[PDB]
Design a protein around this ligand. Sequence first.
Ligand SMILES: *[B-](O)(O)CNC(=O)c1c(F)cccc1F
Ligand SMILES: *[B-](O)(O)CNC(=O)c1c(F)cccc1F
Ligand SMILES: [Cl-]
Ligand SMILES: [Cl-]
Ligand SMILES: [Cl-]
Ligand SMILES: [Cl-]
Ligand SMILES: [Cl-]
Ligand SMILES: [Cl-]
Ligand SMILES: [Cl-]
Ligand SMILES: [Cl-]
Ligand SMILES: [Cl-]
Ligand SMILES: [Cl-]
Ligand SMILES: [Cl-]
Ligand SMILES: [Cl-]
Ligand SMILES: [Cl-]
Ligand SMILES: [Cl-]
Ligand SMILES: [Cl-]
Ligand SMILES: [Cl-]
Ligand SMILES: [Cl-]
Ligand SMILES: [Cl-]
Ligand SMILES: [Cl-]
Ligand SMILES: [Cl-]
Ligand SMILES: [Cl-]
Ligand SMILES: [Cl-]
Ligand SMILES: [Cl-]
Ligand SMILES: [Cl-]
Ligand SMILES: [Cl-]
Ligand SMILES: [Cl-]
Ligand SMILES: [Cl-]
Ligand SMILES: [Cl-]
Ligand SMILES: [Cl-]
Ligand SMILES: [Cl-]
Ligand SMILES: [Cl-]
Ligand SMILES: [Cl-]
Ligand SMILES: [Cl-]
Ligand code: NA
Ligand code: NA
Lengths: 469, 469
Amino acid sequence: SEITYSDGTVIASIRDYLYFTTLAEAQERMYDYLAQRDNVSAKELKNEATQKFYRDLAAKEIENGGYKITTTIDQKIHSAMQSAVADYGYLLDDGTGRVEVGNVLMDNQTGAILGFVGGRNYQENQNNHAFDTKRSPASTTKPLLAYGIAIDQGLMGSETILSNYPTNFANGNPIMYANSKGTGMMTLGEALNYSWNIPAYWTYRMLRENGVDVKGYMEKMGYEIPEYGIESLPMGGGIEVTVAQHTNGYQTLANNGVYHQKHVISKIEAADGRVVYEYQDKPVQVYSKATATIMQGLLREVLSSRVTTTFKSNLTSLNPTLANADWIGKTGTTGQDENMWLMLSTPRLTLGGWIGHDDNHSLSQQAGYSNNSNYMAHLVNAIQQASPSIWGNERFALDPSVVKSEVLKSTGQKPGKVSVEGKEVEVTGSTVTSYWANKSGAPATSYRFAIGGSDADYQNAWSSIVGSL
Amino acid sequence: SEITYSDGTVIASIRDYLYFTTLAEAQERMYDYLAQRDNVSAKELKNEATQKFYRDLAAKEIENGGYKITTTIDQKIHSAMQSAVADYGYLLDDGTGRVEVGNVLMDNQTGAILGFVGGRNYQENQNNHAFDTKRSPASTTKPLLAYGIAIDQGLMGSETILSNYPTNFANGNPIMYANSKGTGMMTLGEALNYSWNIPAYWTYRMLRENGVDVKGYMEKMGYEIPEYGIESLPMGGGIEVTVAQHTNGYQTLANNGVYHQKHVISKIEAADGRVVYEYQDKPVQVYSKATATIMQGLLREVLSSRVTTTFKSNLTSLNPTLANADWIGKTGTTGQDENMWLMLSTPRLTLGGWIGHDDNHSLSQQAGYSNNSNYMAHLVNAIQQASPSIWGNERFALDPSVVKSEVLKSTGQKPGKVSVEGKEVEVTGSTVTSYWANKSGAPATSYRFAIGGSDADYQNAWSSIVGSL
Ligand SMILES: *[B-](O)(O)CNC(=O)c1c(F)cccc1F
Ligand SMILES: *[B-](O)(O)CNC(=O)c1c(F)cccc1F
Ligand SMILES: [Cl-]
Ligand SMILES: [Cl-]
Ligand SMILES: [Cl-]
Ligand SMILES: [Cl-]
Ligand SMILES: [Cl-]
Ligand SMILES: [Cl-]
Ligand SMILES: [Cl-]
Ligand SMILES: [Cl-]
Ligand SMILES: [Cl-]
Ligand SMILES: [Cl-]
Ligand SMILES: [Cl-]
Ligand SMILES: [Cl-]
Ligand SMILES: [Cl-]
Ligand SMILES: [Cl-]
Ligand SMILES: [Cl-]
Ligand SMILES: [Cl-]
Ligand SMILES: [Cl-]
Ligand SMILES: [Cl-]
Ligand SMILES: [Cl-]
Ligand SMILES: [Cl-]
Ligand SMILES: [Cl-]
Ligand SMILES: [Cl-]
Ligand SMILES: [Cl-]
Ligand SMILES: [Cl-]
Ligand SMILES: [Cl-]
Ligand SMILES: [Cl-]
Ligand SMILES: [Cl-]
Ligand SMILES: [Cl-]
Ligand SMILES: [Cl-]
Ligand SMILES: [Cl-]
Ligand SMILES: [Cl-]
Ligand SMILES: [Cl-]
Ligand SMILES: [Cl-]
Ligand code: NA
Ligand code: NA
């Protein structure tokens, strides 16, 4: 029995992450095969005695048999990923103790996993941080569950305005971001580049208000969220994900909105060639192409702006020609710096990244902004050196079907009269193209122009807007 | 034109709360009458120009006409309520500035409002704190939205056990109560008497898990809650209510589960006797009688235990014979002592009570426990002196249909073997009657016995339980 890379080169016959991860998935596939083959009903398969016998059966069936398990893993790439974490993993240590890590590199067109990083060192710690451990995705939830959906429902567009004025959770506590209680109105791009929380809160509220099927979106991408009624959901509250699953969500946006399920096994077959298992592809249009490519545009600037990650500086210095590939991405940060994420894509690959501590104590303030950003730049450069064409040179581009409205920079809506405490006002001033994913684009400017805001908020907002005309 | 008390005695012809409150409701009733009479379609009634003309019409129609508006108000009672707040209202001032107040006294069998208190003094402050201002009900939400429903769905019973171990909101913050992060397991009665938050959190979660129609319950009682997906809902988060509306919810539990809509107007009629308006009664069985009378039992002890209110001590001293009537009740307290409530019933009346500040700054720590408790005791004694039989001498009593199970005091479930990390254990020790509102009563003891709790929680819990056998 052997496990091979994707070219058939043997990984091992039946002591690191690659081996145990591929062996485990293979055993799962063997278990279904065997239940079926023996005509075990999904009823009798609910007995835990029979389950356990079939799992041991599937294990021995691999040890003893002459099976050929074909993984998606790319051997040059996955080795380079291992060398990189061995050489540069110390760069994650931020003086809060040893920092753990997981990464998963995914082909955007197939869902196939090319290489991953399970942790700093299997021999010192076995936990698989790429495939098993589950942590809040934090703000990398935003592009998926809040803004992406709002755009796909045609409820906002790329230059739409949101409230980031102070507001509280229903319990009375203020919604914090770092240690800021909020500012004022802002565009979607500034909310994204900075990653503020209040714009996201208000976005999910608007989704709820319009009864949007938010679950439907998330389940099409294989996310399991037990409870959607949670004020902080769009910031990562009440969600817990593997790096492998989460990469798959960023693969959806990368791939112009088309989900392909993740996999590390493509095929199992007996020595005589019987196909015991075969990955069956199953594409799903989760976001409209308009949505996904507008979103790519915004995420490009998350990395260019360098607000919450230094990544592009780090990569520019290691590999300027690679830094000019069309990178997009989003960071995340939990409320006490327990977890940092960085999600990266080009049109070809998505690289997912998490760091944190196995027991969930805090990292330093900058573990995400700087350390993980620097580590990942090294990791990305290692992958490129090992396979020079793999990230590709293609550009993300707006899909023909995107609609483009002309809007006021200050309302993110079309100019036109509006009512302010008595008189109608000629709503005027500098303008910008906004990208929408509906039929009509952006609407007439109306008073409640932003996503969110209280009466005083708008009183203050409209005061400022007026004195500029 | 005149407004009368319920005996026909004239209040006024067309300068305090009584006048403006009764005039306002009467004008609303006149508006519907007139729209109808003139054959104005609910379409044309959506025009705000026509709305405004009909509201001015309805106002002049009262000034000019010879209408006889019959209120539910009891004249002796409502006067005594006004004297009481004038004499004793200074008892609310807790050194956080002038404290405002509202109360509403409701007949449990009719919904009729007998008397209310709009504030400390109309001449100094017009705001109607009984009928217009809206504030979180805080923990007085619990009996209605969390425990009452759980019991009515047959998901818990009176001695059922809940977790009050530490746990966080989905955002990472711990659920606080005063400045405690939690303790351990506890019975429903201790959770109620103390008013802890974590047992309620876990209760609403279990309701959500079983897809219970919680909205259905709350809307039958006339509550408008815009969003049910809120972790703190059962503690008062995301709800805002008048004292009049909230009294009506406590009227539902008082009246063995049968809602009657609140009203201050019973009848409007023209000089020649034409009935322009008549209150039409509309009873609804919101909770089963089993639920409502079990709940009465628990709420009796909220006041007897004197944990979160001194009320019974205060009343015992002013009027011991009245203190022996069968009082039940619940306090509430917002997260920064912005609002205090006390809800009181006997089988005949429900008295609702709020205090706080018009601008929502904090009250002192004890404004609810002590000051409002003392004020209300005075208010209740004033009402009794003015109408001696009005609170009545009846007892709340368990309804025949309540089921009574024998359960272990420590699991609040029936004794029987259970699995603890290996061996099966003879689950034993002292016992208690638990009251249920289903067909079967309490179930077999199983491992996850409490409402809520994490794996460690139960590890700790079961450790303690074991070493006692
Ligand atoms: B983001 O990581 O920049 C901001 N997100 C948050 O503050 C957040 C979490 F990461 C997780 C739960 C709640 C929350 F607000
Ligand atoms: B109760 O008033 O004793 C406890 N309730 C609360 O802590 C609470 C509120 F009153 C309002 C919102 C949230 C919350 F936890
Ligand atoms: Cl490995
Ligand atoms: Cl592993
Ligand atoms: Cl390979
Ligand atoms: Cl909070
Ligand atoms: Cl949903
Ligand atoms: Cl998931
Ligand atoms: Cl929901
Ligand atoms: Cl797989
Ligand atoms: Cl074979
Ligand atoms: Cl499309
Ligand atoms: Cl750049
Ligand atoms: Cl930088
Ligand atoms: Cl650790
Ligand atoms: Cl346009
Ligand atoms: Cl503008
Ligand atoms: Cl532009
Ligand atoms: Cl449209
Ligand atoms: Cl009055
Ligand atoms: Cl009034
Ligand atoms: Cl009267
Ligand atoms: Cl509901
Ligand atoms: Cl309401
Ligand atoms: Cl809901
Ligand atoms: Cl009324
Ligand atoms: Cl008449
Ligand atoms: Cl009933
Ligand atoms: Cl008592
Ligand atoms: Cl006392
Ligand atoms: Cl005030
Ligand atoms: Cl029994
Ligand atoms: Cl016991
Ligand atoms: Cl007993
Ligand atoms: Cl039953
Ligand atoms: Na972030
Ligand atoms: Na309380």
